[PDB]
C-alpha cells in the first residue's frame, strides 16, 4: 500500500480538498485499494470540525464527495505515511520541526505545489478569501494531485 497525508494548518480548507481530490483520482483509476489517503492539521484549533462550508460548496460544484473530521498530525503519522504533502512554507516549517522530534520519519515531507506542472509552488490559505480562492485551491489540488499520482 502507498500512503499520503495532506497537511495544512487547520485541516478544514486546503488539506481536506486535496485529500478528496486525490481519493477521487485513485478511486476513478481503480486503485484506491492500493492507497491510504488522509489529511491532518499542524494545529489544534479545528479538531473535530468538518471542512469549511465554503470548501464543501466548491467540491459539491465539482461533483466531489468530501467527508472529513479535522484532526491534528501525530508523531505516528511520520512513521506510517510515505508522503506528507503540505500547502505552504509555514506548514513545511512546522512539519520539519515535528519530524525532527520522532525516532522514525519514513515520510518524505514536501510541498504539494512542488508537483504543479504550472509551477504555483504555494497553495495559499483561502480562509480569509472568497469563493474564487477556494476554486483556485481546488484547481491547484487537481493539477498537483495528478502529477503526484503519476510520479508516486
Here the CATH number for the domain that contains residue 113 is: 3.40.50.2300
Q: Give the chain's domain count.
A: 1
The Cα 74–Cα 119 span in angstroms is 30
Catalytic residues: 8, 14, 125
Helix/strand/coil for 50 = coil
Q: Are 9 and 30 in contact (CB under 8 A)?
A: no
List the resolution, Å: 1.8
Q: What is the experimental method?
A: X-ray
Q: What is the DSSP letter of 16?
A: H
- Taking residue 24's Cβ as centre, other Cβ atoms within 10 Å add up to 20
Strands of 1-92, DSSP E: 2-8, 35-41, 83-86
Residue 146 to residue 139: CA distance in whole angstroms? 11
Distance CA 42, CA 7 (A): 7
Owning domain of residue 18: 1-152
SS3 call for 72: strand
**Among candidate residues 79, 70, 67, 137, the one with its CA nearest the CA of residue 104:** 79
Amino acid at each position: 500500500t502507498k500512503s499520503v497525508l495532506f497537511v495544512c494548518l487547520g485541516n478544514i480548507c486546503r488539506s481536506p480538498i486535496a485529500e478528496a481530490v486525490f481519493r477521487k483520482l485513485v478511486t476513478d483509476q481503480n486503485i484506491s485499494e492500493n492507497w491510504r489517503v488522509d489529511s491532518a492539521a499542524t494545529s489544534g484549533y479545528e479538531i473535530g470540525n468538518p471542512p469549511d462550508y465554503r470548501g464543501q460548496s466548491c467540491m459539491k460544484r465539482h461533483g466531489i464527495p468530501m467527508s472529513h473530521v479535522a484532526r491534528q498530525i501525530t508523531k505516528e503519522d511520520f512513521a506510517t505515511f510515505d508522503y506528507i504533502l503540505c500547502m505552504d512554507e509555514s506548514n513545511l516549517r512546522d512539519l520539519n520541526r515535528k519530524s525532527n522530534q520522532v525516532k522514525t520519519c519514513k515520510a518524505k515531507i514536501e510541498l504539494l505545489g512542488s508537483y504543479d506542472p504550472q509551477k504555483q509552488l504555494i497553495i495559499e490559505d483561502p480562509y480569509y478569501g472568497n469563493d474564487s480562492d477556494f476554486e483556485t485551491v481546488y484547481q491547484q489540488c487537481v493539477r498537483c494531485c495528478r502529477a503526484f499520482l503519476e510520479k508516486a
